[PDB]
Design an enzyme around this catalytic site. Structure first.
Site, short mmCIF file in Angstrom:
data_model
loop_
_atom_site.label_atom_id
_atom_site.label_comp_id
_atom_site.label_asym_id
_atom_site.label_seq_id
_atom_site.Cartn_x
_atom_site.Cartn_y
_atom_site.Cartn_z
N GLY A 41 0.82 -1.22 0.00
CA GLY A 41 0.00 0.00 0.00
C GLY A 41 0.84 1.25 0.00
N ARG A 42 0.17 2.35 -0.32
CA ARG A 42 0.79 3.67 -0.51
C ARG A 42 -0.13 4.76 0.02
NH1 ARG A 42 5.17 5.17 0.43
NH2 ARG A 42 5.42 3.00 -0.25
N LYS A 44 0.06 9.29 1.00
CA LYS A 44 0.79 10.55 0.75
C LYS A 44 1.89 10.71 1.82
CE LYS A 44 2.13 14.49 1.83
NZ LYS A 44 2.26 15.51 2.90
N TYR A 45 1.72 10.10 3.00
CA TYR A 45 2.67 10.27 4.13
C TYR A 45 3.41 8.97 4.46
CZ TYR A 45 -0.67 14.12 5.04
OH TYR A 45 -1.51 15.19 4.93
N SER A 46 3.17 7.86 3.75
CA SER A 46 3.65 6.56 4.26
C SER A 46 3.96 5.56 3.15
CB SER A 46 2.69 5.99 5.26
OG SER A 46 1.38 5.88 4.72
N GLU A 47 4.92 4.69 3.45
CA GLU A 47 5.01 3.38 2.79
C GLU A 47 4.29 2.36 3.66
OE1 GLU A 47 8.04 2.78 0.16
OE2 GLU A 47 9.72 3.32 1.52
N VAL A 48 3.58 1.41 3.07
CA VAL A 48 3.09 0.23 3.83
C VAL A 48 3.67 -1.01 3.17
CG1 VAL A 48 1.08 -0.99 4.80
CG2 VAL A 48 1.03 1.48 4.52
N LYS A 63 4.76 0.45 8.38
CA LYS A 63 4.32 1.68 7.70
C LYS A 63 5.41 2.70 7.91
CE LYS A 63 0.21 4.59 7.67
NZ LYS A 63 -0.54 5.68 8.35
N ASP A 151 -10.50 10.39 9.28
CA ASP A 151 -10.25 9.89 7.92
C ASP A 151 -11.03 8.59 7.79
OD1 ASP A 151 -9.15 10.12 5.41
OD2 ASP A 151 -7.15 9.53 6.00
N1 LIG Z 1 -3.06 -3.38 8.95
C1 LIG Z 1 -3.08 -3.43 7.63
N2 LIG Z 1 -3.34 -4.61 7.01
C2 LIG Z 1 -3.37 -4.63 5.67
N3 LIG Z 1 -3.19 -3.62 4.81
C3 LIG Z 1 -2.96 -2.46 5.45
C4 LIG Z 1 -2.89 -2.29 6.81
N4 LIG Z 1 -2.63 -0.96 7.11
C5 LIG Z 1 -2.57 -0.35 5.94
N5 LIG Z 1 -2.72 -1.22 4.90
C6 LIG Z 1 -2.78 -0.83 3.51
O1 LIG Z 1 -2.03 0.35 3.31
C7 LIG Z 1 -2.87 1.38 2.73
C8 LIG Z 1 -2.37 2.70 3.21
O2 LIG Z 1 -2.32 2.58 4.62
P1 LIG Z 1 -2.78 3.80 5.53
O3 LIG Z 1 -2.63 3.32 6.93
O4 LIG Z 1 -4.12 4.27 5.09
O5 LIG Z 1 -1.66 4.91 5.20
P2 LIG Z 1 -1.74 6.47 4.78
O6 LIG Z 1 -0.35 6.84 4.40
O7 LIG Z 1 -2.35 7.19 5.95
N6 LIG Z 1 -2.76 6.63 3.50
P3 LIG Z 1 -4.19 7.44 3.48
O8 LIG Z 1 -5.31 6.52 3.95
O9 LIG Z 1 -4.43 7.95 2.08
O10 LIG Z 1 -4.05 8.58 4.46
C9 LIG Z 1 -4.27 1.02 3.22
O11 LIG Z 1 -5.24 1.48 2.30
C10 LIG Z 1 -4.23 -0.50 3.17
O12 LIG Z 1 -4.53 -1.01 1.89
#
Ligand SMILES: Nc1ncnc2c1ncn2[C@@H]1O[C@H](COP(=O)(O)OP(=O)(O)NP(=O)(O)O)[C@@H](O)[C@H]1O
Length: 327
Positions: A41-42, A44-48, A63, A151
């Site tokens: 996953g991706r 704006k603030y993170s790699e997952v 993350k 969010d």
């Molecule tokens: N615990 C988890 N298990 C599986 N996939 C995950 C998990 N946490 C995050 N992901 C994946 O990673 C993506 C981005 O994670 P997220 O925690 O939403 O980060 P973010 O950088 O805050 N993105 P955003 O939602 O746009 O603000 C999520 O939409 C999921 O698809």
């Protein structure tokens, strides 16, 4: 100029020990106990990434937080720590960071998710009732602990349909609710932003998350994603107005003494309330019921103080089949 109907008192009652995330001392885990595998996953603030906790050889999620205001990192960590053991909140496993660059990562439980555009249309009417009700358990919990998620969109709700299990994730925008505090309105995703964000009303509360849940819920039962499809934060308010109507919008602005932006009035114009029945079709009829519409109608209100609380929402007749099935 607004205080919350519920839970306005929580942060006062729990310590400064509970919300003062500026003065948090972070006990960093060991970076190298974690090996990154697969990028899943991706933001704006993170790699997952899918990763392994090597000592236990366990699938987890790392993350990687784009180096951002340290204050914000301190906030997400303290919130995750606080909410621990709460229903359907993602489990916080560790916080680590790079030895040299000092770039932090959050380590979280893995959830065997299905992407919602695939998963949601496979849902029955009981399924929607069940999963919204499990999401209502997480919002009610975190709201009861002085925290607004801010969010709440389907991307942040992970559903393992085989385990029939739910987690709320991305607490990167979450805040503590303090009565009368002006908060940043640049939160949420355009499609899930409440009207209070779109008119720059800063003294909002937990009810922001309920509007957000409403949009998500209207996606599911009407099979339109997104339900309100604005091209920018201005048009977003217009798409909302074409449904709830402008008569109710002007009484709302008048009630909270919001004055609109001047060129909003070239584009808004006059819209009668479109009734919820006009959104029913053959392909979404499966989800449609007089209970669903009533429930949706008590989340999707201009005035954030007419919206249900997560607790009031759990009592709604719509969730009676899931309460009954509980026993
Ligand atoms: N615990 C988890 N298990 C599986 N996939 C995950 C998990 N946490 C995050 N992901 C994946 O990673 C993506 C981005 O994670 P997220 O925690 O939403 O980060 P973010 O950088 O805050 N993105 P955003 O939602 O746009 O603000 C999520 O939409 C999921 O698809």
């Amino acid at each position: 100029r607004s205080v919350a109907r519920v839970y306005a008192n929580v942060n006062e009652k729990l310590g400064r020990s509970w919300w003062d995330y500026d003065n948090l001392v972070v006990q960093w885990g060991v970076q190298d106990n974690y090996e990154i595998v697969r990028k899943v996953g991706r933001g704006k603030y993170s790699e997952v990434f899918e990763s392994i906790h090597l000592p236990t050889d366990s699938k987890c999620i790392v993350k990687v937080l784009k180096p951002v205001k340290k204050k914000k990192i301190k906030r997400e960590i303290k919130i995750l720590q606080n909410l621990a053991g709460g229903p359907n909140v993602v489990g916080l496993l560790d916080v680590v960071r790079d030895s040299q660059s000092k770039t932090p990562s959050i380590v979280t439980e893995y959830v065997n998710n299905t992407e919602f555009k695939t998963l949601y249309p496979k849902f029955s009417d009981f399924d929607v009732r069940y999963y919204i009700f499990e999401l209502l358990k997480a919002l009610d919990f975190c709201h009861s602990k002085g925290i607004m998620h801010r969010d709440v969109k389907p991307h942040n709700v992970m559903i393992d349909h085989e385990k029939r299990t739910l987690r709320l994730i991305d607490w990167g925008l979450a805040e503590f609710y303090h009565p009368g505090t002006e908060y940043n309105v640049r939160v949420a995703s355009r499609y899930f932003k409440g009207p209070e964000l779109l008119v720059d009303f800063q003294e909002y509360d937990y009810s922001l998350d309920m509007w957000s849940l409403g949009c998500m819920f209207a996606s599911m039962i009407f099979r339109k994603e997104p339900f309100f499809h604005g091209h920018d934060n201005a048009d977003q308010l217009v798409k909302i107005a074409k449904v709830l109507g402008t008569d109710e919008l002007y009484t709302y602005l008048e009630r909270y003494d919001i004055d609109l932006d001047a060129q909003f009035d070239d584009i808004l114009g006059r819209y009668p309330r479109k009734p919820w029945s006009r959104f029913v079709s053959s392909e979404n009829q499966r989800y449609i019921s007089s209970e669903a519409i009533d429930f949706l109608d008590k989340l999707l209100r201009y005035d954030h103080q007419e919206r249900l609380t997560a607790e009031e929402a759990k009592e709604h007749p719509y969730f009676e089949p899931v309460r009954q099935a509980a026993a």
